[PDB]
Design a protein around this ligand. Structure first.
Ligand SMILES: Cc1cc(Nc2nc3c(c(=O)n(Cc4cc5c(Cl)cccc5[nH]4)c(=O)n3C)n2C)nc(CCC(=O)O)n1
Ligand SMILES: Cc1cc(Nc2nc3c(c(=O)n(Cc4cc5c(Cl)cccc5[nH]4)c(=O)n3C)n2C)nc(CCC(=O)O)n1
Ligand SMILES: Nc1ncnc(O)c1NC(=O)Nc1ccc(C(=O)N[C@@H](CCC(=O)O)C(=O)O)cc1
Ligand SMILES: Nc1ncnc(O)c1NC(=O)Nc1ccc(C(=O)N[C@@H](CCC(=O)O)C(=O)O)cc1
Lengths: 284, 282
């Protein structure tokens, strides 16, 4: 039987460290960290995820505010709001929850957030810093995946990692961290493409010690794709009427040596790492 | 028998294209393009390589200088020289040859070159732009790998690509371009040097394209290649110079192959000429 990694437990431990770190930082006389989140429109997933983030902020000692704007906002008002928060010395972290309405250019918005406040690491400069090991702040979901691996003690050096991504924004940053020299796993990394044949993907997963699925299709990762003892980390978000990941949990539970559940796996880790990035931002 | 791709011939053709575009940009009454290359110290590979760059600038009509400085130069001195060239309206392209001496922070140096003059694409925002498909200027060697594949006509949509990386700086830009929606749309593997030949082989035999940038003689042999696959040799091994590939062994099985020397190396220099006309036109 596979070990089932509790994302909740690891996040809870990570959040406890941030509280300790935030409390000491305030005990030295500094301003309490503040995180601002801009939420546009009404994606139910987005509101749910943003509520998780501000809940986690309060219980770790980080002040927070969510600014909700209707979807009919223009790109110019969103830029004015971002520019205001960039200049607010009480605001340490600023993130924009994605996706944005189609009439707004996401890349323009993410590049308008000040790079010192970019707790998501979506600004072009922070993407470059991550590539070049200059960083201060790492994208929360890739860093969350890495902490699951590292804190569980799963070996990466020289190992075979496969990342099944829906987009390059998602699979490449995960791959980059595991490929980086030891954050960084010294691992061989395969990044499967969109619409890649499942059996073509299979010939890569069969070899993998660590399969990381972030494609958003149900049952992409079944037992006939895993060698025994392989760690399987589920990043998929799927509605099928309930939430599931990319892995057939009960099936792969037999074959695999490690498996993360959805919910309760990567999700809580994403939120927890965002807390780490916010204290980092408040410290400069 | 594997068809051998002459990187030299392909690169000389690209330089002819750059030349006409430079000579037309000048005929139209703009300043002739100027490339400045900063060389620190005495690494012989660095000098040979920079020689090939200024020789290519001459052929294609771009003015150029190599500014050679002793290895004892301080970081502050180098930054001051870079700042001067950044502000010199005659300079269009500016690169610092690497490696630099250990008392100079190479990341600080590359991030001090103006991003508009950064014809190597080593400035952090240019690296970020390349990741996010916002760029106008690709690093020369990965872009050269891509032109080879492209002008040869090797298909990449859905194919398996394996890059044998030596550092993250070398294999990952190559993988970035090949995995991207210049696109390429390929399943990409970047192997770390801590994965043995035995496990790397499990990946290379599935690969329609194998790109070796590991700097390890005879890393790629015919057993690791599936029949008909393209093999791009990026490696440099130094009394002769060879690439990572057993050229003779795998010319029997590959579908395409590039030689070392005369393969990726001339493409690197050619693509740098393209980045420099791009920079000159703002
Ligand atoms: C609705 C939505 C939006 C969304 N946007 C999104 N995810 C991102 C990014 C992003 O810019 N970067 C930085 C980066 C490094 C990087 C590198 Cl190193 C190479 C190449 C590209 C790179 N981008 C990321 O790492 N991630 C994870 N964006 C814009 N992601 C999801 C799915 C996962 C989730 O739920 O967050 N959903
Ligand atoms: C001694 C030496 C130094 C050296 N320096 C070196 N090569 C580099 C870089 C670099 O920053 N980038 C941009 C990049 C994109 C990028 C992405 Cl997208 C992801 C991750 C990292 C990334 N870096 C590169 O693409 N390359 C190829 N550097 C600093 N390169 C060689 C081999 C070249 C040769 O000898 O031909 N040798
Ligand atoms: N879109 C973005 N824009 C800007 N920056 C970002 O980081 C994102 N990305 C997210 O915010 N991604 C995210 C996804 C899921 C959770 C999460 O909490 N999942 C739970 C509950 C499941 C549910 O309620 O449906 C679980 O799996 O346990 C948290 C964050
Ligand atoms: N280090 C760097 N710092 C800053 N920007 C860079 O781009 C680099 N990287 C290079 O400059 N890499 C490079 C490697 C080989 C050649 C080359 O000309 N190879 C020839 C002859 C081989 C020989 O003469 O030894 C061939 O293979 O045929 C040219 C450039």
């Amino acid at each position: 039987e596979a070990v089932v990694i509790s994302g909740r437990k690891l996040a809870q431990q990570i959040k406890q460290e941030v509280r300790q770190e935030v409390e000491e930082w305030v005990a030295s006389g500094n301003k309490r960290p503040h995180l601002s989140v801009i939420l546009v429109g009404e994606n139910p997933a987005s509101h749910s995820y943003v509520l998780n983030k501000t809940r986690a902020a309060a219980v770790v000692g980080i002040n927070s505010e969510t600014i909700m704007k209707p979807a009919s906002i223009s790109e110019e008002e969103l830029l004015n709001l971002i520019n205001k928060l960039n200049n607010d010395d009480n605001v340490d972290g600023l993130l924009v929850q994605l996706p944005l309405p189609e009439h707004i250019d996401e890349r323009r918005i993410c590049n308008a957030v000040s790079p010192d406040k970019d707790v998501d690491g979506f600004h072009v400069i922070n993407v470059g810093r991550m590539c070049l090991d200059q960083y201060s702040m790492l994208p929360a979901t890739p860093w969350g995946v890495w902490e699951i691996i590292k804190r569980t003690g799963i070996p990466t050096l020289g190992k075979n990692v496969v990342v099944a991504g829906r987009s390059k924004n998602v699979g490449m940053p995960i791959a980059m961290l595991l490929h980086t020299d030891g954050p960084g796993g010294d691992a061989t990394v395969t990044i499967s493409h969109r619409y890649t044949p499942k059996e073509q993907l299979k010939k890569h997963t069969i070899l993998a010690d660590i399969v990381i699925s972030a494609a958003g299709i149900p049952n992409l990762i079944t037992a006939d794709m895993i060698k025994e003892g392989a760690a399987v980390i589920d990043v998929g978000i799927n509605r099928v009427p309930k939430l599931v990941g990319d892995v057939d949990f009960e099936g792969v539970r037999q074959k695999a040596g490690y498996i993360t559940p959805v919910p309760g796996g990567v999700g809580p880790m994403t939120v927890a790492m965002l807390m780490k990035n916010t204290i980092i931002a408040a410290k400069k």
